[PDB]
């Protein structure tokens, strides 16, 4: 067969991702998948390679697996990856975001975007988002964390909103802070006690 | 704008009017060509220079050497026939 | 780099001769010169090579080699070529 030859080529000497290309790009499909993945496992732990693998894989489960693989060994293009994770989450959103963060902790815009999903939440896509939120909550919750990580005032507000969907926001405000503390107290209360807290 | 815009209604008044009508209300038409050809199809789109798009394209031509007539046929659909080759088109009842 | 040939068969045609030369000189190294510049024939041909070593080798080996009846007199060029 033609596979044996390919294998031999791969073995004899490394040609700077040439053998891999020969294996995968000529076939691609199953065979190609088998090849490229194997190659990845063997030697190269590059970002581009990972991306390629992911593309090849591209169902939801498969995508997730690909993402996981990418996450395993990825130093240079971490921020970029994080975006991908976030996207995946949106389509396990909160979870995805968390994963992205873990991969590459620069990332203010991304954080803001993530928050805005929370705001929106407060059809399939929507469902996915909801699921992600739920996951985050379970983990905790996630949105709040993201906000904290992340303009600051805006983030705080977002967190508060998420909590309401408010208490969390109040807490954050208090932490930041006397007025803030009072606000937090009020949120917590949310009658006389609440009023008192607000006053404080 | 107006120099090109006034040319839009020039199809429906002049010799393209019939073809426009055909396009509007899809009906079969007999299309001839240069090197011994007869095509039959129904109209769908239209432009300035007779570059038409059709449906249910039945082709009838000859590839017979030595003066023997052979009518070969094959179904084509959703073409893009350029205006330089189109000679005669006509709306049949 | 260049090697000035001499004492060869003038009766053979130009293009053909050039081709023959190319065929001959491919064993030593990469022949840079595609066609002859003089256009006089009768031995006078400058075989331009990429490497000097290759040229040297050619000079060594093909000195008085049978090419179209007569023995070719190999020798190093006086001036450097326009391409080199």
């Amino acid at each position: 067969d033609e596979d044996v030859a390919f294998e031999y080529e791969i073995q004899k000497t490394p040609q700077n991702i040439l053998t891999w290309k020969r294996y995968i790009e000529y076939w691609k499909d199953k065979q190609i998948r088998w090849l490229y993945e194997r190659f990845c496992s063997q030697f190269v732990t590059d970002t581009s390679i990972w991306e390629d693998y992911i593309r090849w894989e591209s169902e939801t489960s498969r995508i997730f697996w690909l993402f996981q693989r990418c996450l395993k060994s990825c130093v240079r293009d971490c921020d970029r990856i994080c975006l991908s994770y976030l996207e995946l989450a949106i389509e396990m959103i909160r979870h995805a975001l968390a994963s992205s963060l873990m991969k590459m902790e620069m990332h203010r815009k991304v954080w803001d975007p993530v928050i805005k999903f929370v705001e929106e939440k407060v059809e399939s896509t929507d469902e996915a988002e909801l699921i992600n939120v739920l996951l985050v909550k379970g983990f905790t919750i996630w949105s709040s964390h993201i906000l904290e990580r992340y303009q600051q005032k805006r983030n705080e507000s977002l967190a508060t909103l998420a909590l309401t969907r408010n208490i969390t926001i109040k807490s954050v405000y208090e932490k930041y802070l006397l007025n803030f503390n009072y606000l937090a107290s009020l949120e917590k209360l949310g009658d006389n006690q609440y009023e008192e807290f607000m006053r404080q | 704008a107006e120099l090109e815009e006034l040319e839009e209604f020039e199809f429906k008044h002049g010799p393209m009017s019939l073809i426009n009508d055909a396009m509007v209300t899809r009906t079969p038409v007999i299309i001839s060509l240069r090197n011994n050809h007869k095509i039959i199809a129904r109209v769908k789109a239209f432009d300035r220079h007779c570059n038409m798009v059709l449906e249910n394209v039945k082709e009838l031509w000859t590839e017979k050497k030595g003066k023997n007539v052979i009518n070969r046929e094959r179904f084509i659909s959703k073409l893009f026939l350029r205006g330089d080759s189109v000679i005669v088109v006509l709306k049949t009842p | 780099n260049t090697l000035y040939v001499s004492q060869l068969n003038e009766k053979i045609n130009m293009q053909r001769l050039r081709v023959n030369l190319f065929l001959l000189f491919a064993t030593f190294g990469e022949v840079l010169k595609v066609s002859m510049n003089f256009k006089k024939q009768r031995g006078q041909a400058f075989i331009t090579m990429r490497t000097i070593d290759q040229a040297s080798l050619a000079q060594i080996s093909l000195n008085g080699e049978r090419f179209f009846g007569k023995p070719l007199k190999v020798e190093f060029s006086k001036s450097e070529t326009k391409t080199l």
């Binding site: 031999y8 004899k12 040609q15 | - | 023959n20 990469e30």
Partner: protein, 164 residues
């Protein structure tokens, strides 16, 4: 090393041989001193890119291997090789200008693949081997390979043909 696809890919196909055609390929890092001990395998990697002038000289090629269409390797240079026998049905019409100098063609019967040349090989030269030293070798060549115009730089004349 062995003639693989990767090697072929690597090869410098930039500087075209300006005598005829285009793309004078030199397989591996350099076909001149590549040291291809086995037969020319993985010929499909080139895929009939380009006279072509696939200069595979200064190698250790045991047998001449081809795999392409009628216009793919006219000016093939296999100089200073160990060519024992070069029988094949792939390169029928293409290979006219065959530079097979300093080969290991021993017997006249070894050239029987090239012989019966009316259909077997449309053109072929061959020279500078052990078979050239044999008695009545040129004549034999003339008899068998009529398509051989230039026999070791000197042409196959009418008189010669008559003699053979």
């Amino acid at each position: 090393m062995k003639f693989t696809p990767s090697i072929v890919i690597d090869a410098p196909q930039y500087y075209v041989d300006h005598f005829n055609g285009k793309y004078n390929v030199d397989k591996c890092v350099i076909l001149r001193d590549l040291q291809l001990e086995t037969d020319s395998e993985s010929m499909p990697s080139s895929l009939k890119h380009l006279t072509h002038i696939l200069d595979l000289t200064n190698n250790d090629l045991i047998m001449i291997p081809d795999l392409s269409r009628r216009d793919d390797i006219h000016t093939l240079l296999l100089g200073r090789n160990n060519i024992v026998e070069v029988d094949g049905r792939l390169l029928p019409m293409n290979v006219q200008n065959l530079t097979l100098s300093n080969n290991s063609i021993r017997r006249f019967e070894d050239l029987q693949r090239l012989r019966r040349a009316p259909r077997t090989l449309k053109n072929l030269t061959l020279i500078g081997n052990q078979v050239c030293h044999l008695a009545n070798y040129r004549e034999h060549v003339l008899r068998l390979v009529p398509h051989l115009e230039t026999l070791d730089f000197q042409n196959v004349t009418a008189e010669e043909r008559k003699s053979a």
